[PDB]
Amino acid sequence: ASPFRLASAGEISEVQGILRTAGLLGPEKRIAYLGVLDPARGAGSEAEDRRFRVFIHDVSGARPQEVTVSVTNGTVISAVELDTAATGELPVLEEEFEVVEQLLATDERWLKALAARNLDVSKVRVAPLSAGVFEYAEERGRRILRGLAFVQDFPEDSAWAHPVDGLVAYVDVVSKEVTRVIDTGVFPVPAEHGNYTDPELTGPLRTTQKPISITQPEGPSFTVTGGNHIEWEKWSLDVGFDVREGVVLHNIAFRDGDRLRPIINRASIAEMVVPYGDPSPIRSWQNYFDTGEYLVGQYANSLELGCDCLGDITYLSPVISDAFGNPREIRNGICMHEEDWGILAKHSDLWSGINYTRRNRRMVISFFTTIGNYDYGFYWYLYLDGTIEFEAKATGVVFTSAFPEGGSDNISQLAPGLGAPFHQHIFSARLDMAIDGFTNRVEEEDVVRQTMGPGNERGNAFSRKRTVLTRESEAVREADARTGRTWIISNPESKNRLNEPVGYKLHAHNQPTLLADPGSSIARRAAFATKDLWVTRYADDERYPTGDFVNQHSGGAGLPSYIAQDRDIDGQDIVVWHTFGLTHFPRVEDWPIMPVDTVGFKLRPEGFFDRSPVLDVPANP
Template sequence: MTLADHHHDTSPSRPTGLGALGRPAEVRTHPLDMTSTAEVDAVRTALADAGLLGETVRFAFFAPEEPPKSDVLAAAPVDRRFRAVLLDLATGRSTDNVVSATSGDVVSTRELDPATEGQPPIIDAEFELIEDILNVDAGWLAALAARGIEPASVRAVPLSAGVYDYPGEVGRRIVRAFGFQQDHERDHPWAHPIDGLVAYVDLTARTVDRVIDAGITPVPTASGNFDDPAYVGPDRETLKPIEITQPEGPSFTVEGNHLTWQNWDLRFGFNEREGLTLHQIGFDGRPIVYRASIAEMVVPYADPAPVRFWQNYFDCGEYMFARYANSLKLGCDCLGEIHYADAVLADDLGNPVTISNAICMHEEDFGVLWKHADMFAGSAETRRQRRMVISFFTTIGNYDYGFYWYLYLDGSIELEAKLTGVVFTAAADSEYATQVAPGVMAPYHQHLFSARLDMTVDGVGNAVEEVEAERIPMGPGNEYGNAFRQKRTRLTSESQAQRSADGSVSRAWHIVNPSVQNSLGGTVGYALLPEGQATLLADDASSIHDRATFATRHLWVTRYDPAERYPAGDFVNQNPGGAGLPAWVAADRPLDGEDVVVWHTFGTTHFPRPEDWPVMPVEHTGFRLKPVGFFDRNPTLDVPPSRGGHCS
């Protein structure tokens, strides 16, 4: 949720080789190819030539501007475009620009209205300013002095401000800052929250609007240094090595960003807002998902205290959390026969930054695929499941998030989010927090993610059905009361397709192609199987409800529009609310047999435990997409027995 260590490769980029027209020497031949350093340079050059850069202008956002789906599917000529949002640190003025790296032209530019649209995301250059701003403010220094704390020992954590009933903040670029005491250079300051104290900071004016001091609470002295042997104790010596080997190499191939494995075929991408993206996912030549990503996440906190009520963070839209993607390491983050892919982003100055080993790809055993020992035929057969793993990890302040896309031999797709890191801390006793160490409180909160699934099940004309179990009352035709059946409801419009999960009736959503039938006469489809955990728990009248409306339903379905990419809107930071999904579905467009996008909210409600301190064991959440009628029979009958075993 705040500035993290980057571990990025910041070595000088390759020469761009720009010609007279500003065209990059390194040509991309597919519209969904990964970003190159030459393209970042080309975009920066085009913006500079157009007079849009300057000494105080910084890149607040940079990502590929993917062409419409129809252009890609029609193999239209490649025009590699990028979206760059520029922020002038001196004035707060920001512009939203689209640049063609193919031609070197600025395709469009417009100035943002921060009062109605919100602000660009918070950037590194602003994080770096915060302690200097606070340490010249008399109110902040007086509050620290009253607590006997040296300012030099305080690590200030600037956090997104949200939107509340402060008229003076409208249109201004604001963050709210907490302090944490750091006892020495290697000390983890999250263990030492300076509670009861928050500063509201204007990033453009570089001034403190107000300091709220709700009273002195002793700073906890408990250690949070999970990497200190003096605190942790010696490593256990009872774990024996596990070696993952594939003597003949992996079963997948990667060419550029094109991955093939067994019957699967797809492209992968990466951008600073969504991180890992998957494109044109198909099985045995049949399309299933055109584009899949985690398009937003929000972390709303439950403590209504005067210094904490505003805590809620959109880690994708407010912080561009994939900027801080880790460079993954063999044996630590990934195990086995690994293929890594680098990711190229732009820094605050628009220079290319390469994150080495940002994406990890490998295959892994996943237990029994199918098995039967038949007493009549005398057969005994077992096959083992295997999955292809495509993943990345990112660190955003105190939390670390891993996102793992799994492809299975049986045609299933799964997304697993792994949550770890350090819980956010407080010191004041509260009914809205758990004590995790002496004097250290961890407020209750949620982690709610929005998956954007642009579906193309055997083509672009799809529909969505809600499928659930229906109990049949005892009576005529059900004299013994054992009957239940499947109930199917077609979601024909955007207003109807705002749904919540219900585990009591095994509710799922089937994305079907009404114009394609399998050999048994049924429609081909994929089922979205939700975990069905709690959605947004904040009150319907709250500010966060207005800004994170996407998180109030497990399912939304919209008609495809290439401009509709982010469920809380393009500019989430200090957006007053109503943007994204609630605005789009107001049109109530028809969905039956149309080109549809499925949005799925999933996540966890975290009541921290003492076992989550000082670093949290991984918490898991996610969802599955499972074929239903897409195949005429079990598609894994041709999987051979494991070689070298005793399965045949």
């Protein structure tokens, strides 16, 4: 029984039973997060202990708890009451998404704002938005959501077309109180609709697309065993799923001859945040931590064959817990397939007369999630040649506002009266490395330009410089695209046949990092997003760059606190945290539903193998 298997329905029910028997899950309790924990280092042999961690909210105002249970042993390992003003509020609950609109609908100040604008309260949707930490002292220790209004002209209307600017409200979702209603002035509510299935807006659908059929007549080249263990074209790994992170990859390894060589022990997107750059007080507080506050795995879509996932698809249907501890399956939530990837290697040699061509392929593991207006696909790719890549596909409907009279330095115009505030989508990939095993180190590699002179008389030479990051105090790094900066993770105790350390090189896209002022709340709460690359010493409790309880947690925790331990990372069990994001100045083409745009990173073997690992690929049939 692989200790990396997906949680089963019965395991979640067992958690529920253990919590109930221990007095921790009475009728006032709600599970805000539940997930299996990874096996401890060295546990492999033997005796598994499947532990689950749970964040338990209390709707009656009692303090929430963080609990770890052993489903194997039927026990509570630890249970701690949380002081949310200190360590953060629990993630937003799916049940709280309707509460903001419902509380506002009977509030006299909200009704007064809507009546001034001649808006029928029954048609006003309220986006349930994370609050962050600003100047409102009454919010400390309370579970707050903020609400922005959007008009639905009819039940199938896209409300995003009709933002109600100049108005925001704040709500206490436990006491069921509206704390503040701020109305700074009326703005026209944009009139056009954004209904991308309405023939009046789409026009006649094109009839020019002829079918494309992708099939595998002998089925796929990968196998799935033990529920979630993949073997494909020398790669071995396990596909996990966590309600916060989504798809997680474990034990990524490559079979090089007769040895199973580890590469990455755990790969995940450990945080993703959407900071907004509109200084209007209506939105200047808006920073949506899709992963840490909302939990991206929870909202994973069920992916339909042909439409969402094309080709010969193998699905996983991961199980999560509902708010009461009952298991719920996400049907078809994870898509797995292999696909052709063009030319792998080709050479036509005049002298030998040999013409050689081989094709590449990649294995794809993906899920797609929806967070309000946003929809994101998360894709991991494994290539025949050893490259590993992650790509995010961002789509959905842009978050809208009014477009001010006279224009805006911080908002794009989409349609008459309709704006879209500038924002970024910034990800953190947590890569618990295991290059040839756990003894690893990181070097920053820059290209080196050389001056024409002695030893370089024609002025053509160039070189490279590698700097070992020896301790966490030295391991907070920025991009330098101009100098071709990359980061190499190597195993200083494992040499290839040329007597050089085996490694993998991280190639970033070098997109802008967090733009907010360094003194802002978001720069403190999302400090990870201010730098491209961080290296920490592995510690089982250091899971997220933002810490455990992101919602309404005041800055500081996460990676800057972890790094302060100044641990040795020079030939040790280490974790690379790569920040990468999209800076989005919305364009007209993004309206009324946005075409996908992408961001990501890749790692390529760098002296990991003794020669090309794809010499045994056969000629295409």
